[PDB]
Amino acid sequence: TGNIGVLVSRVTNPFFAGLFDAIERELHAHGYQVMITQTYDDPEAEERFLKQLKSRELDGVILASVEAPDRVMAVAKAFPGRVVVVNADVQIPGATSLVLPHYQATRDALDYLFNQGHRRFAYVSGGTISQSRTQAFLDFMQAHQLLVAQDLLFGQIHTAKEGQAVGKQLASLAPNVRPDAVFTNSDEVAVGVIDSLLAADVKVPDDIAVMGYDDQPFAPFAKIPLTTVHQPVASMAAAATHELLKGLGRQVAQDTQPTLHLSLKIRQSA
């Protein structure tokens, strides 16, 4: 039982740090040494990480972020059983790939908000908005015949500091053009957004409701405890770990599969 690599976009994202930790503690118990690499979504960093498998510095890898699916596919084909992909919004041929239902969770979270009476929506993403979650948002807006306001779309927003800038801009707006609710796609971003709203005496949720994503460790402890979409970190980590161990010939196949569920966690911020 040798070395395993885990690839994530950003280690300072507490969702990725938690996911790594859960994988690592279980693999460590099986005798493996586990190391994490971060990409900041650079495909060259992903390529370089994959060379560690190709050169057999690593016995296996678990990817939680994927930049170039076809490159991952080629490595998985050369190294069957040794590449697992988890919660990356993609199925990679040759690699056991676990996809969670982010489209459904996003539609459900948006339905929730609409049901609280919210009609003007800001949407924040880590990607450039021009993507299961973004399609869920667009589908949602179409279904309720709500006009998408481009002024309330925010792309490439990943951190709490970036969320602070978004919140400061939203707090600046006249009450009649201010969104009713903000879909942040990140508990980090949500904490920042909310902090800026409160600094400007914008009430949360009564003036602007803010929906998080992930249910990160800080979420229940936030100044306005976060309403958010809970990612089942422990369960997905266990599933990914088992798929890799099975592929490495360490573990037997099991009958009982997890169904990995995202769930809406209602607290105070929305």
Binding residues vs its own copies (CB under 8 A):
5, 10-12, 14, 17-18, 20-21, 24-25, 28, 33-38, 40, 45, 48-49, 57, 160, 191-192, 195, 217-218, 220-223
Residue 85 or 211 with smaller CB distance to Cl ion: 85
Residue 47 or 89 with smaller CB distance to Cl ion: 89
Binding partner of residue 99 among its own copies, Cl ion, none, CB cut-off 5 to 8 Å per kind: Cl ion
Residue 77 or 203 with smaller CB distance to its own copies: 203
Q: What angle do CA 69, 71, 72 make, to 5 degrees?
A: 65
Residue 136 or 226 with smaller CB distance to its own copies: 226
Euclidean distance between CA atoms 267 and 181, whole angstroms: 15
- At residue 33, φ and ψ (nearest 5 deg) are -100, 130
13 binds Cl ion (CB under 5 A): no
99 binds Cl ion (CB under 5 A): yes
Element (H, E) at 62: strand 60-63
For residue 66, the minimal CB distance to its own copies (Å) is 18
Interface of this chain with Cl ion, residues 65 to 94, rule: CB under 5 A: 87, 89
**How far does Cα 89 stand from its chain's mean position?**
9
Whose CA is closest to 181, among 123, 96, 229, 222? Answer: 123
For residue 21, the minimal CB distance to its own copies (Å) is 5
Euclidean distance between CA atoms 21 and 164, whole angstroms: 28
- At residue 81, φ and ψ (nearest 5 deg) are 85, -10
**How far does Cα 145 stand from its chain's mean position?**
28
Binding partner of residue 38 among its own copies, Cl ion, none, CB cut-off 5 to 8 Å per kind: its own copies
Binding partner of residue 222 among Cl ion, its own copies, none, CB cut-off 5 to 8 Å per kind: its own copies
Q: What angle do CA 93, 94, 98 make, to 5 degrees?
A: 70
For residue 179, the minimal CB distance to Cl ion (Å) is 27
- At residue 60, φ and ψ (nearest 5 deg) are -165, 165
Residue 41 φ/ψ region, left for φ over 0, alpha for ψ in the -120 to 50 degree band, beta for the rest: left
Residue 24 or 215 with smaller CB distance to its own copies: 24
For residue 242, the minimal CB distance to its own copies (Å) is 21
Residue 20 or 79 with smaller CB distance to its own copies: 20
Whose CA is closest to 163, among 180, 131, 187, 181? Answer: 187
CB 219 within 8 A of CB 18: no
Residue 119 or 223 with smaller CB distance to its own copies: 223
100 binds Cl ion (CB under 5 A): yes
61 binds Cl ion (CB under 5 A): no
The alpha carbon torsion through 123, 127, 128, 133 (nearest 10 deg) reads -50
For residue 255, the minimal CB distance to Cl ion (Å) is 24
Residues in touch with Cl ion (CB under 5 A): 87, 89, 99-100
